User: Fold Asparaginyl endopeptidase from Clitoria ternatea.
Amino acid sequence: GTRWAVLVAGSNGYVNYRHQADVCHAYQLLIKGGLKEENIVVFMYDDIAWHELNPRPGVIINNPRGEDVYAGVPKDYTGEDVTAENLFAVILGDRSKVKGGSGKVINSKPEDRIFIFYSNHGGPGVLGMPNEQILYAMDFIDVLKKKHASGGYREMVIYVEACESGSLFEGIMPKDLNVFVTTASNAQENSWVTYCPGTEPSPPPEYTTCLGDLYSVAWMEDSESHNLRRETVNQQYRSVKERTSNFKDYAMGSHVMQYGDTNITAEKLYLFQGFDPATVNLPPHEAKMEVVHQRDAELLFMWQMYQRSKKTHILKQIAETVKHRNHLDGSVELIGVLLYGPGKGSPVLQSVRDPGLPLVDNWACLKSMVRVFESHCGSLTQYGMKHMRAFANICNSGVSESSMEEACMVACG
Amino acid sequence: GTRWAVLVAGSNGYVNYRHQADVCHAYQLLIKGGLKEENIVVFMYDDIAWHELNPRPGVIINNPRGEDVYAGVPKDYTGEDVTAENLFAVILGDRSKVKGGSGKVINSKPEDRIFIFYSNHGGPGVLGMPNEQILYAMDFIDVLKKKHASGGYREMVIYVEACESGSLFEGIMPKDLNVFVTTASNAQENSWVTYCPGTEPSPPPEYTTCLGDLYSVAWMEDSESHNLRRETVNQQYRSVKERTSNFKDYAMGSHVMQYGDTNITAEKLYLFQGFDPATVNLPPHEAKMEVVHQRDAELLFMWQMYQRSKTHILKQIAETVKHRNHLDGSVELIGVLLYGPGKGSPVLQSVRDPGLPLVDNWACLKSMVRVFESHCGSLTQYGMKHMRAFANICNSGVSESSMEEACMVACG
Ligand SMILES: *[C@@H]1O[C@H](CO)[C@@H](O)[C@H](O)[C@H]1NC(C)=O
Ligand SMILES: *[C@@H]1O[C@H](CO)[C@@H](O)[C@H](O)[C@H]1NC(C)=O
Assistant:
């Protein structure tokens, strides 16, 4: 068979350098393993390498060792072509459904294997796509069911780096699709950022943005230190779960979760990621990492720019960002008060379902609640994905769309 | 000697019925004990007894037994005359410094005793006075020092019902003034509301507002069920501390604290509150109460009105929540601008160890509030919650010019 991959960075902006650095590093790792460029589809906004703030024009790095990972990465879906619609069309292997981009798709055969890696922002039941796009978990599961039904592959492995990423699969991912999934976090935890300015081992001092994400660099650094003909998918999962837990300190670490067909964990990793002949296998028998969560990276980036000195212009941008977050947080809190009463709003909106249950029972209701909210309160933006469990809980409570319209009108109009 | 009292409700509005009900109940208790009306000064906005929402016009009750406590209460300082300036002038006993009101003051003699009871809203280092007035703790301590210096009394007992009320005395109340103080809560705890609609023992069903406050009804119900010629100030403190703790469940109770001269705890309570002749032979000196948080009572009152009705009430709830969010967000943003994103909240929210003053420079505290309100608008009663953030900005060494810049960016 043939090995294929789909690598997706769901964000943009220099502050989010790390998501595109993670995806570029994954591309280089797969090419070194012998996967062919024609079988790897890359989604990256592509605004980082030549960004005016990049201290190394034309270069992207993903760890303090400073090796460029940008040269040679294909421009399959970049800019406004990085959309959920193109991602689904690419996975399905239907070139007629793609809009723009290179036209490269996963037109795979039954004997082939596929590896999907996403890095970005997210929230309960959702992943980000650039410029305020939201990708819903059930729509992604639906694409996997369609791909499986058309006999497009033998096995698939999916790695997802995003906040509350366990919520994209919990209670909804079937185990009969020949798909194995791991996520950076459980359904109620944040994802963590690594290689930030001021941390040790020291990233190059010219960088003002973080270089990578914890779970992402954990799997990539693990692959590029083992002979992948001998390391199994299970061995990588355990090593990534250990590193991402950050010495089991869940105040600065997360629980890596697994979903889908666990029989795939017995497979050798080279069947999905290739084999790099240069790698000297490092036997199994590292230091605690200084990390920040995805949601905190933005203000830290702006504050670093303010401290490195236009000085009052950065302070105004920080104020606008904080005010925007406060507007979204306050509007959601207020909707809970109007729907359930003071003292009952927060418990309803913030309650987390028992393990194993889906985030929401009706995913079309979830999309409608977001639509009604944004029509009165404005776009959720990437930050607003944090509030997706509040919208799911309004759906699950039995509150009607007409009642949500009334509460949003009072809260925001 | 002569026994004097000053009773103050620091709030207004039908939602705050309880603070005036507590003060009216205290007045009746003191009159039953033989204190004279001429020696009791009452501060109450006086908007409750005849309020359009009051189901018993001209009546105020302070517990589910429904006994009126309003009839006969004097109108010394009401409406716009309930001010910190008049409270200070009354305590000092200087009628020429009073503006409006009856002119009654505590013109006490060296042999006299004084009892002060305040019930209201508050915050770290501050108490409320009606219509967005803030009374600072050090200004109240200063009045006590002045009154002591002029030999105006033998001993004084002060009971304070307000959120974070321990912060009004911690690190600043001297023990050499012949003044003993108890507070409903410690310096970092809220105070609790009793007799709310829907709770048991059931208040009369026609009430949509809470009837009293936990620490306040604890001391008053204790006083009126005992012979005060035998009960000491210490016995009342221990009984009030036990009841206010609500079976030591500090998720629905608070820590009653004591400050000042603890030698006064050995005194019989009748020397301050009088003796009710009907209590002579009562036995010598309970169920868990359902209580509501003092800052939570407002939205619960509006929601009860909404349930018993209306889109106009929902709009009022939205305006209230949006206003609180504006104040909370502006304060949080100022902390980010002054200290940076991962440091603002720890600086603004850090609580000093017990026994330390809230702020080292009280004039700086007033200046920070002044600068904030000039850009962000009035703190209002709710905004008193943020007084520890302003104190922490002062204590951190941040300059007034830096506070001006941060407030201008956050609110202008
Ligand atoms: C996994 O392997 C076991 C043992 O062969 C088998 O019983 C099970 O059905 C397989 N998993 C799935 C998804 O069916
Ligand atoms: C309290 O009484 C004790 C004697 O029991 C005395 O030593 C102390 O100075 C008194 N306190 C004050 C503040 O006078």
In short: Chain A touches chain B at residues 296, 299-300, 303, 307, 312, 315-316, 318-319, 322-323, 326, 330, 333-334, 337-338, 341-343, 410-411 (CB under 8 Å). Residues B 175-176, 261, 263 surround 2-acetamido-2-deoxy-beta-D-glucopyranose (ligand 2) (CB under 6 Å). Chain A has two domains: 3-293, 309-412.
